[PDB]
């Protein structure tokens, strides 16, 4: 039979319909008065969190992060530029808002590593994401066969190196075939042409 989890999932397919819509319209009011990064005791979308590796357990942490909508906040050239390089308005950053959110959370929790993250919706001016972080030093994590991989030294600061799921997609690593010539194994080894 359907899991209860499937109901949270199904609600979130349409955040502007039904009960969820009412919920969001109420919640965002409180969110807009909250800070940049807010630790929350429970995930807003429990299905998505568990799907992404969240467990209810010591050393698992969730935080909701607000980030402004839209394109690059970009200063105009102060010296000579050819016309191609004179743009301000239409330029957009190469990292998606989700990854920005993940970096801001990870900085808030310097000892914690980013596991994953997901969208909780947006208003007109900003987007919210909830980011799951893990304490690599807590023995409840160190002994978990499902999460203990994240404790390894080479996983330090994974978010800042693009090793996160949002990192990897945003780096163009989704396809194993055609289109991935300049992304895999890394953007840099391919000379910065991947995107």
């Amino acid at each position: 039979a359907r899991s209860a989890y499937s109901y949270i999932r199904d609600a979130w397919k349409n955040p502007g319909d039904g009960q969820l819509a009412e919920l969001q319209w109420q919640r965002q009011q409180e969110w807009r008065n909250e800070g940049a990064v807010e630790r929350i005791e429970r995930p807003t979308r429990l299905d998505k969190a568990r799907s992404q590796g969240y467990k209810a357990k010591q050393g698992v942490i969730v935080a909701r992060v607000s980030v402004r909508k839209g394109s690059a906040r970009k200063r105009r050239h102060k010296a000579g530029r050819r016309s191609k390089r004179q743009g301000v308005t239409r330029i957009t950053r190469r990292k998606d808002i989700q990854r920005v959110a993940e970096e801001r959370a990870s900085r808030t929790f310097p000892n914690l590593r980013v596991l994953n993250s997901y969208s909780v919706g947006q208003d007109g001016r900003q987007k919210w994401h909830e980011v799951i972080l893990i304490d690599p030093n807590h023995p409840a994590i160190q002994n978990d066969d499902d999460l203990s991989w994240i404790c390894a030294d080479d996983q330090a600061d994974r978010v800042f190196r693009g090793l996160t799921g949002a990192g990897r997609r945003n780096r163009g690593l989704s396809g194993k075939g055609k289109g991935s010539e300049k992304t895999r194994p890394s953007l840099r080894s391919n000379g910065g042409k991947g995107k």
Binding site: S83, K84, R85, Q86, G87, R90, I91
Partner: protein, 92 residues
């Protein structure tokens, strides 16, 4: 200068002399689906558009004759070299 609307001459399709009718070529409409159209849209961007920032212009004082010769027998048309004419009018 003046020209007959109809006269006998060689039809390269029939391969024999036939009465032809002559008309000025009317321009056909662009579809906007051609490769050059796709290239314009794709390559235009921030700053100068290269060739797409060019504005076409200029006129020779007198254009060449631009004409369809259509066979009144088989109905097919052929084209010919044009010649400079300030004005071309048909005698019906």
């Amino acid at each position: 200068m003046q020209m007959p609307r109809r006269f006998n001459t060689y039809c390269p399709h029939c391969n024999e002399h036939q009465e032809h009718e002559v008309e000025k070529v009317r321009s056909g409409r662009q579809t906007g689906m051609k490769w050059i159209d796709r290239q314009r849209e794709r390559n235009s961007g921030i700053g100068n558009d290269g060739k797409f920032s060019k504005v076409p212009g200029g006129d020779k004082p007198t254009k060449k004759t631009d004409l369809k010769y259509r066979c009144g027998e088989c109905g097919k048309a052929h084209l010919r070299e044009g010649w400079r004419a300030g004005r071309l009018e048909f005698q019906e």
